[PDB]
């Protein structure tokens, strides 16, 4: 149940695209989770980074500060939380495009209703914690170049813990698809 959390920056040089952010991040490590806090500043791109391994600063990826944490969470206590994720549904293509195996493709489509998104949150947390208060911040679609598009949502609010080790399991594994493109990282804080 250890980890460490570090505030890093990536020069605007490598920070041009989503994938290059990924790369910039793994290159300062000889897996992890991250959250974008400021996308382009002139200096570059600020990022909160949760990891197993120790970052050491590189030419394009500058580590600002680093401290190393492990989790002691007491059940029953309420906490503030923040999580950027991409709630989806998996369906058969209505356009009926076909896969290399020969049959109809599958498609991941975003949930575009507030209720559905919150439902998705509570579901994903499940028994680990109950959401007491949430607001589902709508964000602009992100694109990348294969090539494609993901649609994130940023939940901020208050939860109550129901199963400390489970929640910790969640926090280190990540929550939802697209873990490698900025989503997944759940941050907790004392009320």
């Amino acid at each position: 149940a250890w980890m460490y959390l570090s505030k890093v920056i990536i020069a605007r040089a490598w920070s041009r695209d989503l994938y290059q952010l990924h790369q910039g991040l793994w290159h300062l490590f000889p897996d992890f989770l991250f959250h974008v806090e400021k996308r382009n500043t002139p200096e570059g791109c600020h990022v909160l980074l949760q990891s197993a391994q120790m970052p050491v600063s590189t030419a394009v990826a500058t580590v600002i500060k680093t401290k190393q944490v492990e989790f002691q969470l007491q059940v029953g206590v309420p906490l503030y939380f923040r999580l950027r994720a991409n709630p989806i549904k998996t369906i058969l293509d209505n356009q009926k495009r076909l896969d290399s195996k020969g049959n109809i493709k599958r498609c991941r489509v975003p949930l575009i209703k507030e209720a559905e998104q919150i439902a998705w949150l509570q579901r994903k947390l499940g028994n680990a914690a109950r959401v007491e208060d949430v607001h589902p911040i709508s964000e602009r679609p992100q694109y990348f170049s294969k090539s494609g598009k993901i649609q994130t949502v940023c939940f901020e609010g208050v939860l109550t813990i129901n199963d400390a080790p489970a929640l910790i399991d969640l926090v280190q594994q990540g929550i939802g698809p697209a873990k490698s493109m900025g989503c997944g990282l759940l941050s907790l804080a004392p009320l």
């Binding site: 041009r16 695209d17 694109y143 990348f144 170049s145």
Partner: peptide, 8 residues
Amino acid sequence: LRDIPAFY
């Protein structure tokens, strides 16, 4: 614009 797919 170089930072945008739709452009390309």
